[PDB]
Design a binder for these strands. Structure first.
Lengths: 95, 78, 107, 93, 78, 95, 107, 93
DNA sequence: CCCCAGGGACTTGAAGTAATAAGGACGGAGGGCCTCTTTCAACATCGATGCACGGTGGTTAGCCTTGGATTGCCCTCTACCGTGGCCTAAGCGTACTTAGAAGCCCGAGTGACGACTTCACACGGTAGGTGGGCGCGCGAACTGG
DNA sequence: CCAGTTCGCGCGCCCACCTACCGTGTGAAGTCGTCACTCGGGCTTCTAAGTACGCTTAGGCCACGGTAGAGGGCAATCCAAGGCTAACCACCGTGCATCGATGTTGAAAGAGGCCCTCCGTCCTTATTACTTCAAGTCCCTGGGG
């Protein structure tokens, strides 16, 4: 059995849009947090809930960006998001 | 460490965003955007910590960093 | 003297009028706080909380659930134009997003 | 160290509108952030109004105008009604 | 009176925005957009006017109204 | 002598981007303000400087919108802004 | 008594230290204001005004003008990467815009 | 009624960096709004910082911390340096 | 590319008016005093952050076949451009009318404040209810023919 | 549609541990009472906000022929997704060691409330020079040949 490209993708949207779990791996994300924070001050510790707060904001923020990116993509009569779409979205947001 | 944000993870985030098909160049673009985003928030949260003469970043410090950047977060004490 | 009657009960409110008054006086908002301000402020806050909770409880009920969780709150807030506008730039932890698929992507 | 919160009051309000519905500890935290947030906005906006009108007292007028400015559309209308009703009852004890 | 924002006027504003060609349907959209923006700002300015017990909307009131909508204006006394 | 379609357009960009005067006729704007204000309170007066302050904000806002609208149009490999472009710009800004 | 020496003069500043101090006490920012807070704050505002004004005056000279008008300030703020970021969400009355034409529209 | 402004001080600084350059009344209005605008952010941000630490006094430390949060990139570095230099001289009269 | 040309930039020469330099005033800084207390620093206490190790899968990394998406060519047509004609009223002058912005004076209705008191609230504690893992069969949308 | 299937998913079967209700002390909220004082109200005056009403360009509104950008159709080419595998490490769970979050307390460094004194800054005026408009000249980019 082979689903045609797109069938499973739409299935994933519905599943992932109904669920609420965090989607970035926790450990790799933590190392990144520590790695970025390392450059400002050494021997910096982080409360476990602090790391979770950063992760929640980042995932929520990034999802929001992908939604706006899609609208830009659709505007060009395309269904595939591309880097130029993110750039456009961000420019309009003022970032 | 940025490579820890794997392709499937970036894809899943896009799926939540309602994206149906994704170009292969998005993964590198997303990593760059996230890094910038993270730097700003951590910068402010770390700044708050240093003022309190503390050595451990708390959850409150992060929330405040988000608030002043117009990204109020609910659920972690403010 | 007579039994102490909280200012909240005198105003028929559940929110703590006494607490709100202290927070206003010590919150560096103004030099003086009028006797009606904490009462008025508390009443508005209580009403708004009721509004969200009412919509959130309805969403919870639709999912055959008896406890409101952050997911239910997101549904309630994003589905109400006025609440959504008020809380537009707010992120609910563990809230997810609203099921929304662009029409052009559907089969 | 005791940490003040609106949890009890949030629970009371919930029990009036949904007697058989509970709320998780996480959701309770959400409400606390919410209450404080709205409070700050109103209190912060109220401060500007008082300062702009060169009045050192914050009264019913400042909150009423603050609510009319911050709350969108009908939320303000009903909120203003609630506040006015509460203050009126309070003034008559 | 809304028609007083004439077609040439809308064209001139677009030129300042770096627009080279304008579709014939843009004029109606812009008028609608302008209506929304004005209502919001005027609403807040008038709201301040009642609070000050005044009958004349001052430039400072508008400035205050603009600040709260994230459109801070410089040049009218603050 | 007849300029080719588009030649004069570039000239207007340079002229109006070099100038700073307000571009909407003052009287029409004044009439607009009074009609809109009537719905909130009757017989409302406005300081002449108040009307000026509104116009400055309004023009700047519209200029900002046309700039972002253009980027959307350019994004779709078009040079003409259309109502669908304005809608997109507004949507991304959150309006 | 000794001749009165302004706090502004002791710190080598042009901005009014005393006024800022009073403005902090009457600005509803905190209950108390340290003696070092107004001096530090005054210097920062002075530095920033100098920065903006310095860059704007240069723009004026390039336009062969000797008096600053709103146009020059807009140029200074939008043409400077650092100051532009700080003043992203500000509208300068009578400022106009930066000459910017998309490359795709040029002949 | 006398209305305070930064006009005199703005003019002095201009004459130091550009001795032969003036400023229009309109530009002066812009500068007053700017000074007050930055002032509000700095004073307002220092308050939250002060409030978070349960301190009732806003000191140069909070201003320094508030400045770091608001001023972007190298602006912050130089602004912090200037303030510290000025304050140091001030404590020694 | 050329000829003819249409617009804007540049450069005086007259007006003129907003910059601005200069003088008088007052209330707002500044010095000075005695005073209340916020906070540095000292020392104390334990929660919870860091680190580690052994599994234990679930989940990734990479590759292959793929057919549907992208995009460049092409036509084509019709939706704006630019010029002209022609009329309307916006910009401004000048003047008048007057509504309320702004101010000065006043008191009493108001909130800060202190002393004292008490019960509403939060922390420790207990015992059931709600919901998630485990596990299965039912609802039906999809896709090769 | 026929026909088969994969996915979705609702409905239980427990367990379990997350939360509702309970017991306790207290500190901050309530009440009395004093007293300082803010702003709502009366009254007054001057500003500029509205109004009118004329003029004079200057710009908006309409028509019109055209042209090039927007758009539909077509094909090739190409490149992300579905499915397959081997393998990695995220995470559970436990466990320990130890930093620093966190709390308390002394007293003095600090900032205040008040007071007398002085001059910095603001209102007011008069004078310019820098700006501004008009005209005349020149550069230069533009479009049909």
């Amino acid at each position: 059995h082979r689903y045609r490209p797109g069938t499973v993708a739409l299935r994933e949207i519905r599943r992932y849009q109904k669920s609420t779990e965090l989607l970035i791996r926790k450990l790799p994300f933590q190392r990144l947090v520590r790695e970025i924070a390392q450059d400002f001050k050494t021997d910096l510790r982080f409360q476990s809930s602090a790391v979770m707060a950063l992760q929640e904001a980042c995932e929520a923020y990034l999802v929001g960006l992908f939604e706006d990116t899609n609208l830009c993509a659709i505007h060009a009569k395309r269904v595939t998001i591309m880097p130029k779409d993110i750039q456009l979205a961000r420019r309009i947001r003022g970032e | 460490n940025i490579q820890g944000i794997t392709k499937p993870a970036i894809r899943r985030l896009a799926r939540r965003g309602g994206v149906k098909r994704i170009s292969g160049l998005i993964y590198e673009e997303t990593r760059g955007v996230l890094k910038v985003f993270l730097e700003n928030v951590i910068r402010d949260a770390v700044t708050y910590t240093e003022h309190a003469k503390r050595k451990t970043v708390t959850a409150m410090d992060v929330v405040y960093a988000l608030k002043r950047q117009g990204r109020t977060l609910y659920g972690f004490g403010g | 003297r007579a039994k102490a009657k909280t200012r909240s009960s005198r105003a028929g409110l559940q929110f703590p009028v006494g607490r709100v008054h202290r927070l206003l006086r010590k919150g560096n908002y103004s030099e003086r706080v009028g006797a009606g301000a904490p009462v008025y402020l508390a009443a508005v806050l209580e009403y708004l909380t009721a509004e969200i909770l009412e919509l959130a409880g309805n969403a919870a009920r639709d999912n055959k659930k008896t406890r409101i969780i952050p997911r239910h709150l997101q549904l309630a807030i994003r589905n109400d134009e006025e609440l959504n506008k008020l809380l537009g730039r707010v992120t609910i932890a563990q809230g997810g997003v609203l099921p929304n698929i662009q029409a052009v992507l559907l089969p | 160290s005791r940490k003040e919160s609106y949890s009890i009051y949030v629970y009371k309000v919930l029990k009036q509108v949904h007697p058989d519905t509970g709320i998780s500890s996480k959701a309770m935290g959400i409400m606390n952030s919410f209450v404080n947030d709205i409070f700050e906005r109103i209190a912060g906006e109220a401060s500007r109004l008082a300062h702009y009108n060169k009045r050192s007292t914050i009264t019913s007028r400042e909150i009423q105008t603050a609510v009319r400015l911050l709350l969108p559309g009908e939320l303000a209308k009903h909120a203003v009604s609630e506040g006015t009703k509460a203050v009126t009852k309070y003034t008559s004890a």
